[PDB]
């Protein structure tokens, strides 16, 4: 069982924070089936400052981890593999051990 990759989406805000931000890769991924579309309508003016894309990304992983794997392939579906794969090479190994 491998904790690190959770805490890596959770420590990816802001890598995604500036290369994804709350838009349709966030919003099409929770409407996909993760979370309910009721928290897309509150995300939307429910935050004022940054923590708008912060409990966004929290929220992927606070559901379940199943969503985590998903999202690395909605962005490889278009053309994402370089963001992708910094997400994918710390959820396995980090560099060393």
């Known amino acids: 069982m491998d904790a690190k990759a959770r805490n890596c989406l ?22 996909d089936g993760f979370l309910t579309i009721s928290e897309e309508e509150k995300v939307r003016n429910e935050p004022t400052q940054q923590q708008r894309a912060a409990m966004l990304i929290k929220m992927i992983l606070k559901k379940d981890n199943d969503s985590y794997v998903s999202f690395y392939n909605a962005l490889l579906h278009e053309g994402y593999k370089d963001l992708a794969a910094l997400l994918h090479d710390g959820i396995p190994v980090v560099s060393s051990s």
Request: hydrophobic fraction near 35%.
């Open 10 to 31: 959770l420590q990816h805000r802001e890598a995604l924070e500036k290369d994804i931000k709350t838009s349709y890769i966030m919003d099409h991924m929770i409407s």
